[PDB]
Input
Amino acid sequence: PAIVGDEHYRVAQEVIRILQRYKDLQDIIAILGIDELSEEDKQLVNRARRIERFLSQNMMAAEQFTGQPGSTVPLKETIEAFDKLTKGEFDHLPEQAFFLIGGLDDLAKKAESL
Amino acid sequence: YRELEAFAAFASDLDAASKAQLDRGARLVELLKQPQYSPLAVEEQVVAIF
Amino acid sequence: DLNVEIVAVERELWSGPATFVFTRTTAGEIGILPRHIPLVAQLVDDAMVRVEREGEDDLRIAVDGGFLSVTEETVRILVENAQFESEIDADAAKEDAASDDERTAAWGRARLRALGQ
Amino acid sequence: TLRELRGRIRSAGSIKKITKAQELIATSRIAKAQARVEAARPYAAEITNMLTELAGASALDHPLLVERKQPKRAGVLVVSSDRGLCGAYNANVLRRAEELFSLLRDEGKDPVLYVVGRKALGYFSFRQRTVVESWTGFSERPTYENAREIADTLVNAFMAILGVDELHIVFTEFRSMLSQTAVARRAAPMEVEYVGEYSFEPDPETLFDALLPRYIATRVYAALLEAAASESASRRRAMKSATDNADDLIKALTLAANRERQAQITQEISEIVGGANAL
Output
């Protein structure tokens, strides 16, 4: 936090915490599935999947493979988007709306698309 | 499809759109199925995939 | 002749043939023979049913808040909980007959009125 | 690492055995619950028949049959399992329940929760939505006593204390062993359906009033039995899925254990022959 700021650090640590809890639950996810978790952990997993997919991005170099053009997300927008994600502000959108999306505005666009 | 195929076997029911995707994939996979020693010229491959 | 179908909400209890069926409906005591006009009647809270059929002994049923439907062919008794006389624990009936709860007391009285008490 | 993989293999084998046993037990209990539904059907048919006759001889003005002037509140009876391992079952119910709420919210009626099942009770306890009353311990094997209690509470709330102007039941219909769908039914006010073309004692109106609560109790009982059968079917499917996942995990862990075993043998041979080749 002395370097990137506490707004950035807090969001990054919350994201890492959510993903670590998801990795810990991976065993139950593999055998039984999301359904048998506790409600707290179920919500955590449902937003952990969305955080994991939102970390994906349509890279510029990917244009030769996907055909889609690439996108650049400024750091402030990334911090705000992941802060919203960790707080649950996007738990209603489908998970696929986060694949290779690269931004809040384009996320809303794809959510409208689906 | 190949993710939806596994998902469907255990879901009680699926959306009409999901069933449409399943039925399209079950035909695409059969389309790509091909016998041995029977290569297709790109002229026939494009039509088959079409 | 009549075929008496005592059917509970959970399961069917009895479906044998019968010649006469007697029970205390909310309008008084009623007896039904074959070809009785179609009828629907609510049994009283402590209603008991007595079935007379060819050969076998009279069959007494404790009925909890049942309904009696005389039909062209079947007299169907729909019951919440129905107990034959053979299934009655007499001491339990005697104890329950004095219960404070109105429904429990009515059910105990129905069990007794079947028990011959 | 190989020790961890062997332990994981043992764990997955034990879980495979347990889930396989649960799958077979769930098949047997599907059979039992469906047999109970079949046993309960004839009473429902006959009570519906006599209700139709009474209605044909009734004014149809009982409160259960007429829409409140301004519905400001509505009851929702969510039927849910009291034990887990049923896969999406509870969620499929609960999601539908919330869908119904979104409708009720859009219609200006705030839902009031009545919950049957421990899982739905926890579901709502975490979302802090207050349940007025909850019943538990009979979703696996319901009895008409529980259904009568539920129906009496719901009907008393409808007649009313704040009370409700409407009540729905959300439960998982079992249509076939493959299909189990959460549906929401409005169980009051009932709508009269004129389908087109007897005596009563003392009068058909009093019999109608005494029978409508009984009919609602019977329908709640049928819904609970349907939910139990659907719960057992979902448990069978979820346990089959868990058994398949455990078998796949056992296969993957066996491949990993074999790779680690070969790697350890090769590493040991490398150390031994490096020591010989030095000496």
Q: What stands out?
A: Residues 97 and 113 of chain A are 9 Å apart (CA to CA).
